[PDB]
Design an enzyme around this catalytic site. Sequence first.
Site, PDB file in Angstrom:
ATOM      1  N   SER A  94      -6.304  -3.318  -3.394  1.00 29.14           N
ATOM      2  CA  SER A  94      -4.716  -3.799  -3.807  1.00 29.14           C
ATOM      3  C   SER A  94      -4.844  -3.341  -5.530  1.00 29.14           C
ATOM      4  O   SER A  94      -5.069  -2.104  -5.745  1.00 29.14           O
ATOM      5  CB  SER A  94      -4.542  -5.018  -3.537  1.00 29.14           C
ATOM      6  OG  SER A  94      -3.276  -5.217  -3.711  1.00 29.14           O
ATOM      7  N   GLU A 128      -0.141  -3.024   6.463  1.00 28.22           N
ATOM      8  CA  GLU A 128      -0.291  -3.314   5.057  1.00 28.22           C
ATOM      9  C   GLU A 128       0.752  -4.226   4.502  1.00 28.22           C
ATOM     10  O   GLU A 128       0.719  -5.185   3.676  1.00 28.22           O
ATOM     11  CB  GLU A 128      -0.116  -1.983   4.177  1.00 28.22           C
ATOM     12  CG  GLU A 128      -1.678  -1.344   4.520  1.00 28.22           C
ATOM     13  CD  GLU A 128      -2.571  -1.845   3.252  1.00 28.22           C
ATOM     14  OE1 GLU A 128      -2.207  -2.456   2.370  1.00 28.22           O
ATOM     15  OE2 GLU A 128      -3.716  -1.466   3.270  1.00 28.22           O
ATOM     16  N   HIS A 156      -2.698  -7.093   4.656  1.00 29.42           N
ATOM     17  CA  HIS A 156      -3.318  -6.634   3.316  1.00 29.42           C
ATOM     18  C   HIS A 156      -4.377  -7.570   2.847  1.00 29.42           C
ATOM     19  O   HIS A 156      -3.851  -8.807   2.479  1.00 29.42           O
ATOM     20  CB  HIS A 156      -2.143  -6.716   2.307  1.00 29.42           C
ATOM     21  CG  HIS A 156      -2.376  -6.211   0.924  1.00 29.42           C
ATOM     22  ND1 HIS A 156      -3.058  -4.866   0.663  1.00 29.42           N
ATOM     23  CD2 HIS A 156      -2.294  -6.761   0.037  1.00 29.42           C
ATOM     24  CE1 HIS A 156      -3.032  -4.577  -0.555  1.00 29.42           C
ATOM     25  NE2 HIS A 156      -2.794  -5.588  -1.285  1.00 29.42           N
TER      26      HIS A 156
END
EC number: 3.1.1.7
Lengths: 535, 533
Positions: free
Chosen positions: B200, B324, B437
Amino acid sequence: EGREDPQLLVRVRGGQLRGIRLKAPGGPVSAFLGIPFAEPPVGSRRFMPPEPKRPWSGVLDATTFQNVCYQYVDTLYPGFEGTEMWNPNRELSEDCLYLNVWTPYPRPASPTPVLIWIYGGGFYSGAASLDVYDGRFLAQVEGAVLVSMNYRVGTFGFLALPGSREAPGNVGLLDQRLALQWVQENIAAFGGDPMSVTLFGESAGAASVGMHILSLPSRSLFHRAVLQSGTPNGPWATVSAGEARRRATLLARLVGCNDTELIACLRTRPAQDLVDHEWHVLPQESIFRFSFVPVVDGDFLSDTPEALINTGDFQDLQVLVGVVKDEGSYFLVYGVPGFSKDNESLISRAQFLAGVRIGVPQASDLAAEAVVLHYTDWLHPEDPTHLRDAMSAVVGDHNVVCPVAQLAGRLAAQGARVYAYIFEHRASTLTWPLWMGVPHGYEIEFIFGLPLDPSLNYTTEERIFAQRLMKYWTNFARTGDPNDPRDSKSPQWPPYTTAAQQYVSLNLKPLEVRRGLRAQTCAFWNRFLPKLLSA
Amino acid sequence: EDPQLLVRVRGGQLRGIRLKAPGGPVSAFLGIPFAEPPVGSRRFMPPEPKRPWSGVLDATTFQNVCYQYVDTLYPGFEGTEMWNPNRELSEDCLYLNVWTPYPRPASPTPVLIWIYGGGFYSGAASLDVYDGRFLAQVEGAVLVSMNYRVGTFGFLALPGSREAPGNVGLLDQRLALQWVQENIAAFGGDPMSVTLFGESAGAASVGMHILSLPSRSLFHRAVLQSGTPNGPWATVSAGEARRRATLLARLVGCNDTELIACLRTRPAQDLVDHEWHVLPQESIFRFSFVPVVDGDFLSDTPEALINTGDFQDLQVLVGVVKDEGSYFLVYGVPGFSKDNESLISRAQFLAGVRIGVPQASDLAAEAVVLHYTDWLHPEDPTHLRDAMSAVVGDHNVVCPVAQLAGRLAAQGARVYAYIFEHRASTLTWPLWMGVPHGYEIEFIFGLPLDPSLNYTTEERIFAQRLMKYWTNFARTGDPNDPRDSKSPQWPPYTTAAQQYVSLNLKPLEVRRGLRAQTCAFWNRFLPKLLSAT
């Protein structure tokens, strides 16, 4: 009379006619060819609406096809069958408003449902007398009454100075409507039932059928409609009044000329001079664009077809609509560089970009980009075979597949009974290259049943297949439903709905039902692209 | 006094601690200072190297977590809490951790440096999902994680100013990278084989060290999981950075020097309290204080520097998870909840698109809705719900990752791409979120190998495969096992073939196209739409 065939003589409102007894493969048919339905729109009548035909004396001979309306002739592959079959096969003349009737022989007993054919040819070409429009098979095998008319094309049928009185526009659609009235009044003398009249046509003909659906005076002249690969909506079938006015003025200077003086001048030019300059008035380099087409006049067309389609009430309407597999391949060899009937037309990324601007001539740089991004295969963005098929898909989708999908969707959401098909079988007899797939216009020989003629070297399944479609087309004519009243073994053809978006495939295999009329890609063409082009 | 737990780095002596990994013990040195505490007047300022110390410094506990926002959405819910701070918050947080095998490696050993994620506003090197013991015990790696300043402390910038030049959280990372150079040898690590990997905002950080010259002499290979320097959330212009700085200053009571000074006088929580109030639009997957394009650390936009840089030397391993965008929807877009199934109306989907693409015009938002609608079922709420997740996933991670993979490959680099598709049996978010995610990390770090965590056997076997892939890429720039033959080999992502592999319980499967059609919309067309609406 005296020694004549007593079953070939018929009276209509204008006089007596002598038809001809033709052979279909399974028996004779009656043919009445070249019946006049209008005063010859020549001289001072050029560009004018058609007047009804004055009655004649004696027996008019109705045994041969009459003149085809004055029109451009295709010269890009001289002698090639794939183009000549659409070229005029009688003398070119402005005296050309004649129609043809095929009936069973002897003429039918009960009143029989009537099929009226309106040919295509992008509104610049076409004739009711071409071989692929031969009615003898539908009349012999299905017992139908088939009628096809000539309407004026090109400048003679559609050059308009909108709002003037010497060139109101749409006179070629009026030609069609006058034949429709003629059928109302006279078709009963042949056994046809004026209370069961089904219009069907292809390309500009389908568009024409569409415009009779949207024009109030025509709606009292037919009951069911079939639109094959053509729509009154879409980018090529109509022009604003302003654009129509623009082209008529330009063409008048190109041949050397207040609307009255100008039209007076055009009426002095030889018909060939106008044909010769007809293509020079198109605003851009384009394919699938035609100089003189129906104008949105606020008369025949009270508003744009998209407006009228989007709002009108269509609960009494029953339509059959569909497309061929490769609607756009045909048009590529008439303007996009890199394409020919003779090589395999593998193109470059550069040639695809150039082609997208010719195929979408009205697209801004941004809109043209969107088309390129949507149609690129980003795993092989330079495979020349796939850019060729994508170029074919752009033109087909933009001009037919998505205008038809759009029309099927509105009519369905607005009360009409819609039946939708895709035609996927490619005739063994076909002389275009294989890369063109099933090209625009190549269902027609099967609907009219030409493969039942043994001298045409089709295949047996092509014979059986043509009978299947003749049955589909005539059952829809009789009943509003292509499905056979009995035949419950063969699969059924559902109406097309907003809900299930069903359509059938037409090929050598039994009816197979699918969903979605190119749904994802037509959302680009019919929903996003318009909003983008107001920017 | 166990001499394997005694290390002499350049600032003094450390004592570590021996911990149990399931198949052996590991040396751990937690809490090593690499910078002078950035407190007081050193708030917002570049870090400076830690001064030497006397005696034997205790490196056996995780130090503090950098002062940061703490999530309140689902208090007590593991899926939320597992990312929340592990230790007491403190502006004095510039510490790093080192795991090595026990005994200390004999020969020099490749180093993996982990840079955590958390949207540049949160995260800590001490969460359990970042436990270095498994990679050090099982693959014999030296593994280093550092804290870096997040939120206003790491990334509040008045561009051009001297007392808030921006990007100091990245300088924190850079400083820990110099520390590893000067010191990892003392632990058995090879300073000549350092692989960065993060996820990330951490992957974005890794990406920015690729794009910044001083950092490029501090590592050799890079791994970017679910994040990129390019894209809509990882950077801001010097313009927009300055705006958010001077606006937050206004909401706390505050010439650049005079303004920064007054900011350095406020309690840390006074700044965190207004951290989210400076975002221009109502958004999701947007963060108020992030790296700035400062013409210094980042000489140009990430996009400009990837479009034009020479990367013959680079080797990267990049990837995404299957879903995601799903995590983010419950943080802002009406209709979405951990608790029900977030079936949404159409109008909810159109409204959500303005929050997921907060910079979209009406025309671009309609372009998004039209492109993601399934026109066979344009109203089926399961479709629109999965569509909403995908707009957010594609806009913010997938298409940015694909854009990065394509330019790096095009310009010399060796690129391996994956998609992570296994959903953890232990996962505590609803099923509709798929593989959200962040939920590949637990597997890369080998947590299934700890029996107490109640992962299944195939998940433990999976975890071992991925630990092999990541370490192999660290030793060699190539994730394939140099002893394992067998046809499913991981091919390099190239511009022509566009191959990538799928990481799940089934063997390696090769696919082509990084979501290439829809990413053509995001990377090629949508810019043209906004850049000329």
